[PDB]
Design a binder for this molecule. Structure first.
Ligand SMILES: C[C@H]1CC2(CCN(C(=O)c3ncccc3O)CC2)c2c1n(CC(=O)Nc1ccc(C(F)(F)F)cc1Cl)c1nc(N3CCOCC3)nn1c2=O
Ligand SMILES: [Zn+2]
Length: 432
């Protein structure tokens, strides 16, 4: 019988079309053969590609185990070398080793009692994936150095990585000496995994594991407190933003802390100018500004001395602010990936927030003419596909939450979202 009906008339859209660079044919064959999947989710590819091609440290926040294991199991299987998984979760490690064996991936649990059986075979390069406790790993840095020299370690995964922080709710003394991994193995990337989206605990993990410029990702969350809306521009900045404003004592303000993302530096200045006329507490943020001025706006926003930052998408990576009540995209966003990163900064305190896109078909990020100028065929086609996916989202009458979760998240996240989805607080299209 037919197992899916994903194909639609008027589209040749695979999940691979929205990955940069594209997975090659052997990478797809490997994924199918050893993991029984046809495609990578964007976050899975971000982690896998950063490990394989850049040897980059990662902190991967993953709310659940749905789609998690692929990020650290796939790279060593693809290159045919060795990946180490450090975890205190014995039963889960046993379950994953058996699943790998049943997929014809040579994997084992290494510990003191298991060493007589597996250690010689690990040293000779017969295992793709080795699971160890932090206690065992801490007394065997010599072994890891030999495996790096003789085989080459694709990555070290540290699961329950929040256990390294004495400031968290689940501290393990066993994790303390994992700080030595980067000293013993400076060229081996670490993928630190945790379920906690706490910026405080992320900083502790990066410090304690000595991670260098780690790629930070955060997935598996439904974010029921984010309301999504897409609305047409009206041809006038004050006309467009007036609906978001309330008059208080001869000055106007937003409901709460607000970020307005604009495509151009020019537009950030234009929008700031119109809000300044209303004596609204706001500041401009773009790369054309000085280091001190940018640093000042950051601190002032964090201290609630300004209510609104009008910014390019240069603003956001350095802000851990939990009470962002409103994100406005003033102009179509660059693509769905950037849009996802930007709306994800809203309502991290878990209270009701709104994310509005104000767009016109004439917006710079819907202009195909700028993309036709791209002479690299592969990059041109990717940029056109990303613009088309963004345009399809903006134009849609379907649930905005369903579109975003379908693209970025494991299907399990959609099952958790069925409560918020279709209600008055989900999105503009669910309210109608
Ligand atoms: C988007 C990612 C990336 C980011 C962290 C990385 N980042 C940086 O700037 C950054 N980079 C480097 C260093 C430090 C940094 O801050 C951008 C923001 C982040 C994400 N998420 C996930 C998410 O929101 N998914 C999500 C789910 C549903 C919906 C929808 F459709 F229903 F509306 C939309 C989206 Cl986008 C996330 N989720 C929670 N929460 C989960 C629930 O508890 C509260 C925190 N926080 N959070 C995040 O911070
Ligand atoms: Zn909806």
């Amino acid at each position: 019988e037919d197992d899916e009906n994903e194909a639609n008339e008027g589209e040749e859209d695979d999940d691979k079309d929205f990955l940069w660079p594209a997975p090659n044919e052997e990478q797809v064959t490997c994924l199918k053969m050893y993991f029984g999947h046809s495609s990578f989710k964007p976050v899975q590819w971000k982690v896998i590609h950063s490990v394989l091609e850049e040897r980059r440290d990662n902190v991967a926040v993953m709310a659940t185990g749905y789609g998690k294991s692929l990020c650290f199991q796939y790279p060593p299987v693809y290159v045919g070398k060795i990946g180490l998984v450090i975890s205190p979760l014995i039963s889960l490690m046993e379950d994953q080793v058996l699943q790998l064996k049943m997929s014809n991936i040579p994997a084992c649990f290494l510990g003191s009692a298991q060493s007589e059986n597996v250690l010689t075979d690990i040293k000779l390069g017969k295992y793709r994936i080795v699971y160890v406790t932090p206690e065992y790993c801490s007394g065997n840095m010599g072994l890891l150095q030999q495996l790096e020299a003789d085989i080459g370690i694709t990555l070290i995964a540290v699961d329950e990585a929040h256990c390294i922080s004495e400031w968290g709710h689940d501290f393990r003394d066993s994790f303390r000496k994992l700080g030595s991994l980067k000293t013993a193995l400076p060229m081996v990337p670490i993928v630190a995994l945790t379920a906690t989206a706490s910026s405080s605990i992320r900083e502790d993990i990066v410090r304690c594991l000595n991670l260098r410029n780690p790629q930070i990702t955060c997935t598996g969350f439904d974010r029921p407190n984010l309301y999504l809306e897409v609305r047409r521009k009206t041809g006038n900045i004050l006309q467009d933003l007036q609906p978001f404003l309330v008059k208080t004592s001869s000055h106007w303000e937003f409901e709460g802390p607000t970020i307005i993302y604009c495509p151009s530096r020019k537009m950030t200045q234009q929008v700031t100018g119109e809000l300044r006329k209303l004596n609204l507490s706001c500041g401009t943020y773009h790369a054309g500004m000085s280091f001190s001025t940018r640093k000042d706006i950051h601190h002032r926003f964090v201290r609630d001395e300004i209510q609104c930052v009008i910014a390019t998408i240069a603003f956001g990576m350095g802000i851990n602010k939990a009470d962002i009540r409103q994100v406005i995209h003033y102009g179509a966003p660059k693509d769905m990936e950037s849009y996802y990163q930007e709306i994800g900064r809203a309502g991290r305190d878990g209270l009701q927030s709104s994310c509005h896109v104000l767009w016109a078909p004439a917006d710079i990020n819907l202009n195909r003419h700028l993309l036709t100028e791209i002479r690299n065929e592969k990059f041109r086609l990717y940029k056109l596909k990303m613009m088309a996916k963004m345009e399809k989202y903006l134009h849609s009458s379907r649930c905005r939450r369903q579109i975003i979760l379908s693209h970025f998240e494991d299907k399990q996240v959609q099952k958790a979202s069925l409560g918020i989805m279709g209600t008055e607080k989900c999105c503009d299209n669910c309210r109608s």
